[PDB]
């Protein structure tokens, strides 16, 4: 039954990503909202706050949100593979039957979110958090850095460039006082670039975390 449910989770996330990307393709030239979206080009931030507000109408931003959902779906896929293998395939043949690595708890625990959070994330992180002092501490040290970059992406995702433009202007004043005005002009990032940098850091941090966790775990006990 747990396999049934996780397979339909996979189907769900795949269909959502298809929705976002295919919607981006079909509504790339024009739509009911913007009748001339083709003349604005492929990559553009908005069409003003008018008609309610038209943030993120380019096909490029559909690609952006697609990147987020791709991250989600594939994270679930590789979690499924890791736990299923550690619970039902791998392990030692001790000539007393088969003793798997995690004792075979997939069929009883993979139907509750508490099951995943406890038996997978909380139980299987004991090796990546206690790797200090051994020959494996690089993973337990790149773990935290991956978290840091993940949480660092949120500044770029949540906020907006007008605030940073004004703050950068005040610091430019603090340089104008001491005659260190840069003759190239400091400008904040454009909207599209801020979004892109946000998703870059997001994927980097998340994937690096998963990398560190997997390698520490299975190099330690495998």
């Amino acid at each position: 039954t747990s396999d049934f449910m996780v397979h339909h989770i996979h189907a769900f996330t795949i269909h959502v990503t298809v929705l976002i990307l295919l919607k981006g393709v079909l509504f790339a030239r024009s739509s009911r909202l913007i009748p001339d979206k083709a003349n604005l080009g492929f990559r553009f931030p908005c069409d003003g706050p008018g008609r309610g507000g038209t943030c993120q109408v380019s096909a490029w931003d559909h690609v952006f949100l697609g990147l987020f959902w791709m991250y989600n779906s594939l994270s679930i896929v590789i979690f499924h593979f890791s736990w299923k293998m550690q619970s039902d395939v791998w392990g030692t043949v001790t000539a007393s039957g088969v003793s798997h690595i995690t004792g075979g708890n997939f069929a009883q625990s993979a139907n509750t979110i508490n099951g995943w959070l406890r038996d997978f994330l909380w139980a299987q992180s004991s090796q990546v958090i206690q790797s200090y002092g051994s020959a494996l501490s690089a993973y337990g040290l790149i773990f935290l850095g991956a978290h840091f970059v993940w949480a660092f992406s949120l500044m770029f995702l949540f906020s907006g460039r007008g605030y940073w433009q004004e703050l950068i202007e005040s610091i430019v004043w603090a340089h104008n006082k001491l005659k260190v005005a840069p003759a190239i002009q400091p400008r904040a990032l454009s909207i599209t670039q801020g979004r892109a940098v946000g998703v870059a850091h997001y994927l980097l941090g998340g994937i690096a975390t998963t990398w560190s966790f997997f390698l520490a775990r299975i190099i330690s006990v495998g």
């Binding site: 981006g24 393709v25 030239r29 096909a59 791709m70 779906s73 594939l74 994937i207």
Partner: peptide, 19 residues
């Protein structure tokens, strides 16, 4: 992971052809 990234790229460049 490599498969996932490549498929998202397919989406992006189909959009660029549309534009």
């Amino acid at each position: 992971w490599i498969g996932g990234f490549c498929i998202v790229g397919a989406g992006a460049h189909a959009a660029i052809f549309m534009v």
